[PDB]
Design a protein around this ligand. Sequence first.
Ligand SMILES: C[C@@H]1CC[C@@]2(OC1)O[C@H]1C[C@H]3[C@@H]4CC=C5C[C@@H](OCC[C@H](CO)CO[C@@H]6O[C@H](CO)[C@@H](O[C@H]7O[C@H](CO)[C@@H](O)[C@H](O)[C@H]7O)[C@H](O)[C@H]6O)CC[C@]5(C)[C@H]4CC[C@]3(C)[C@H]1[C@@H]2C
Ligand SMILES: C[C@@H]1CC[C@@]2(OC1)O[C@H]1C[C@H]3[C@@H]4CC=C5C[C@@H](OCC[C@H](CO)CO[C@@H]6O[C@H](CO)[C@@H](O[C@H]7O[C@H](CO)[C@@H](O)[C@H](O)[C@H]7O)[C@H](O)[C@H]6O)CC[C@]5(C)[C@H]4CC[C@]3(C)[C@H]1[C@@H]2C
Ligand SMILES: C[C@@H]1CC[C@@]2(OC1)O[C@H]1C[C@H]3[C@@H]4CC=C5C[C@@H](O)CC[C@]5(C)[C@H]4CC[C@]3(C)[C@H]1[C@@H]2C
Ligand SMILES: C[C@@H]1CC[C@@]2(OC1)O[C@H]1C[C@H]3[C@@H]4CC=C5C[C@@H](O)CC[C@]5(C)[C@H]4CC[C@]3(C)[C@H]1[C@@H]2C
Ligand SMILES: *[C@@H]1O[C@H](CO)[C@@H](O)[C@H](O)[C@H]1NC(C)=O
Ligand SMILES: *[C@@H]1O[C@H](CO)[C@@H](O)[C@H](O)[C@H]1NC(C)=O
Ligand SMILES: [Ca+2]
Ligand SMILES: [Ca+2]
Lengths: 622, 309
Amino acid sequence: VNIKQFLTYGRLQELYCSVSEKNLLHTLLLKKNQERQAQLKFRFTFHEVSKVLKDFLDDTCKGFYQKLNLPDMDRRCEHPWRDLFLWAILQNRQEMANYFWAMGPEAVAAALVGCKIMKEMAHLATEAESARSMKNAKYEQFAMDLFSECYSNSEDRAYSLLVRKTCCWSKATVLNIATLAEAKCFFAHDGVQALLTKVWWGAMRTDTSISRLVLTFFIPPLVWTSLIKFNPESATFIRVVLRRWNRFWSAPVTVFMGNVIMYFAFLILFSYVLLLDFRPPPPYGPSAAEIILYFWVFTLVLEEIRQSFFTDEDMSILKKMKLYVEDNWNKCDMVAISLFVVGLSCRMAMSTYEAGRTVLALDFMVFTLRLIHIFAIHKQLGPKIIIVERMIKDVFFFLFFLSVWLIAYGVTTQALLHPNDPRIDWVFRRALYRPYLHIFGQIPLEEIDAAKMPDDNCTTDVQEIILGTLPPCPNIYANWLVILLLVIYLLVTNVLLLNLLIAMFSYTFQVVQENADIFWKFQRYNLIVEYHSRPALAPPFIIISHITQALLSFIKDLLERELPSGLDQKLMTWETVQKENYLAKLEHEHRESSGERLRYTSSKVQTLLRMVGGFKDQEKRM
Amino acid sequence: DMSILKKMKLYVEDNWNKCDMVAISLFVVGLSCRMAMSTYEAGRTVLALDFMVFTLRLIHIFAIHKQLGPKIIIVERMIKDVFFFLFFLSVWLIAYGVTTQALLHPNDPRIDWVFRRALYRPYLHIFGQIPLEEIDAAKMPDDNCTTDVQEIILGTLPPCPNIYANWLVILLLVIYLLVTNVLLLNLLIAMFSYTFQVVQENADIFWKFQRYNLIVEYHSRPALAPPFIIISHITQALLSFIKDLLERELPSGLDQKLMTWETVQKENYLAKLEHEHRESSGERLRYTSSKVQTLLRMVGGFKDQEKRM
Ligand SMILES: C[C@@H]1CC[C@@]2(OC1)O[C@H]1C[C@H]3[C@@H]4CC=C5C[C@@H](OCC[C@H](CO)CO[C@@H]6O[C@H](CO)[C@@H](O[C@H]7O[C@H](CO)[C@@H](O)[C@H](O)[C@H]7O)[C@H](O)[C@H]6O)CC[C@]5(C)[C@H]4CC[C@]3(C)[C@H]1[C@@H]2C
Ligand SMILES: C[C@@H]1CC[C@@]2(OC1)O[C@H]1C[C@H]3[C@@H]4CC=C5C[C@@H](OCC[C@H](CO)CO[C@@H]6O[C@H](CO)[C@@H](O[C@H]7O[C@H](CO)[C@@H](O)[C@H](O)[C@H]7O)[C@H](O)[C@H]6O)CC[C@]5(C)[C@H]4CC[C@]3(C)[C@H]1[C@@H]2C
Ligand SMILES: C[C@@H]1CC[C@@]2(OC1)O[C@H]1C[C@H]3[C@@H]4CC=C5C[C@@H](O)CC[C@]5(C)[C@H]4CC[C@]3(C)[C@H]1[C@@H]2C
Ligand SMILES: C[C@@H]1CC[C@@]2(OC1)O[C@H]1C[C@H]3[C@@H]4CC=C5C[C@@H](O)CC[C@]5(C)[C@H]4CC[C@]3(C)[C@H]1[C@@H]2C
Ligand SMILES: *[C@@H]1O[C@H](CO)[C@@H](O)[C@H](O)[C@H]1NC(C)=O
Ligand SMILES: *[C@@H]1O[C@H](CO)[C@@H](O)[C@H](O)[C@H]1NC(C)=O
Ligand SMILES: [Ca+2]
Ligand SMILES: [Ca+2]
């Protein structure tokens, strides 16, 4: 059977129409068909398949079947193994999909696509057993093992395989598909990390010492010395010195360094303006340092705009905005920008001056916390960010129990101690703020224990309590009960509930620390990619880079590169050979396994018993 | 006798050696400053720090005991954990402290008090020092306070804390207490627990290496303890001018006998390894499958020959 001749588009559509009607793919195709019928022979059509694929990849299946809209039904599929793999993946058939992947040309990209589709469908997950089998798909492992084989083979063709635009997946890069699939374990591969290190250092050699690089950063003229080794490849002298300077000052590591230093400078200036040089409204004018801070934040806004609208390429504006706002650091920045603008606006008026100063203090808090993202560069600091996020989630869930318990205890103690205090603010103080402070050692027994209550001048008159002339007299009717409740609260809260939260923290830390390497390598990938696409200048100076880019656009890649047809075909054949070698080694390993040997021995012993019995009977005939 | 530079490099490679060097330098600087009236207090301060260094130097003798040795390594790794935790702690404390200083004392110009309220007070919150009389308006005393900047700088009266939005200051303090005191402190403690677990898994090996190092260190030391060690030093110098348990040179016959004995021991060890490998389950399975294959082929041939008859 020749699959190239066997699989026509009509045949493929017939296969898509022959879905068992008990699996998720049939339901999804039914929903697509119902939507199409509402908006406007074969039960299902390639339009429905394209829409279903769009709900899992949304960029990869660009005109897989919409190109001709519908293609000729007697025409053979241009990518038969790709189509068969996609069809066998959409319906949770993993063995068949494994076979189709083993016969397919672009296997790393196919495996990453399969892992993405498996996780998205396990998010859909109509059933639960299918969802569990689809959680353990092991396609990212196929991609990782094939790429390990490829990287061990050549280590230079592996990088090109990482960055080349695929032919079977609509010019999508393997790294693009891994990002779409969120394949954290693939990004943690040694080959991917090596390519990331090569991108990180740019023109310099990756073995460059940190001390030499920092010292050359702080002494720019020393870059023309041989202190920093660079990778191979009047007017000439100027050109070569400019080339050396640009190659050093364009590397993502130096851009990162400069951005970190200028962010420290920005925080220092922000703190100076907020704490020492915050002047009255424009009647007495903002200080010059404040205007410098305004310009700095304006350049930050320009950088945000560049990242949200003019990032790297041309897509839908809405798609680019969605990609921008999907990053949590991006929305953190947006919050900081909005807070600064509101603060500045309120500060410009006398009646809102204090509110503006308050909002600006909160904005400094937000910017300083924003500074945290640079810790992903270090293995010992990166994973702790993820730990802190999960631990914040743990705190959020613990807060339900804490709030219920504190409401009960605080209202009971407020009723027992100050039944005649009408003021609501003091009700909430004594009911929640004081019990919360008990957790951290703040136990004011002079307000709770009668024997410790001072002889202060106190009133029982409600009007005098409301007026605030004298503090209310605490009720000591049954003070033993108040003290017993405080003892119980101290035990329960401070030991039991606090250590329940701490045990939750410990479990979270243990779970993240088990996978610390993978998490940090994914973080490092994201940080290196972020600073590789950034302009070489740090804000405020980034205004120069923005102006230069705009002027270049008006007047007139390391990753995701397009290859010549011959080199592309050579790479595809090389990867196919690597996949064949990997599968052959897997088969050989399987054959020599203990279970396989046991099965072979038992079967052959059975055959030997039968044939030896026959031979013995024949001999006994003689 | 080696290269002088090699011996110095070997000396300074030991951390206890550089600890001692720090202690000696501190004592010398302290004594020198103490010799002058204008540097007397600085000399006393440096000598106090030197006592601290010497007392911590005393820790090295704990390697002699199995229950004390490994704890030194645990403490070193835990200090590294603290160093890495300090980045998060410093960033968070800078954010919170500057925000609260701006909210509470926007008119206080003095930088020392800025840094006090921005980092020293939030750090002390971690250890139960929560002065609500400076943060909560309802707990603020009726003390005699000024809003004049000149009077604040002069120090005549304490500055009046700003109570503009005190609910926000209190909410920030509540959030800081939760985040820092529970979350971040227990993140550091979980790091500590992981470090302790990793070292305690290999406690025996670490302590035995420590014991080796300590025994070797005190085997090569002169028999007299300082100050008295001056007598041993003078005796050694006099012996050098006028005129080993480990690392000993053997006669040629005994050396050859030892080499042959070790070769025989290695041969016995390798033979036992080979015998263990042969009788393993996997090897037996491989042998049985291969011989069953051979038996199938040869029995088929024999059966065909019999069927010829
Ligand atoms: C292992 C486990 C640990 C936890 C726990 O169980 C065991 O421990 C138990 C111990 C127990 C507690 C044991 C004892 C008591 C005392 C008892 O009061 C007796 C009531 C009498 C009558 O009403 C009040 O007396 C008098 O009051 C006056 C004030 O009103 C004081 O005058 C002061 O007045 C003014 C003070 O402002 C000022 O003029 C002066 O300062 C002074 O003149 C007198 O001096 C004092 O004599 C109340 C109960 C209490 C606190 C127990 C509570 C429960 C425990 C904590 C257990 C735990 C589960
Ligand atoms: C489970 C979880 C725990 C954590 C938390 O969430 C839930 O708990 C919540 C509880 C909440 C708090 C609940 C209540 C409040 C009170 C509120 O003030 C109301 C504002 C008004 C108006 O501006 C001020 O009032 C008045 O001020 C005056 C001072 O200025 C006082 O006069 C004093 O003046 C001088 C004091 O020097 C002296 O003359 C005397 O001593 C006295 O005359 C009055 O007596 C008082 O009436 C501010 C907010 C706060 C603290 C909440 C903050 C957030 C919580 C902790 C929640 C947690 C997330
Ligand atoms: C963590 C939750 C948030 C929401 C909430 O409980 C904790 O906060 C508390 C703060 C309370 C305020 C505190 C002070 C005052 C001033 C007083 O003159 C009138 C009542 C009012 C507004 C109170 C109304 C009820 C409020 C919002 C409580 C509310 C359930
Ligand atoms: C753990 C870090 C060490 C470094 C540092 O932050 C914590 O220490 C802080 C102590 C600060 C001092 C404290 C007191 C004074 C006296 C005052 O009249 C002038 C300013 C000055 C020197 C301050 C300058 C800034 C300093 C070094 C801060 C500096 C970022
Ligand atoms: C309490 O107020 C009354 C009002 O007359 C006064 O006489 C008395 O001295 C006050 N006591 C204290 C402790 O302030
Ligand atoms: C505060 O200082 C003024 C100066 O006249 C004085 O009259 C007043 O008694 C002082 N109050 C306190 C509480 O020291
Ligand atoms: Ca951003
Ligand atoms: Ca020494």
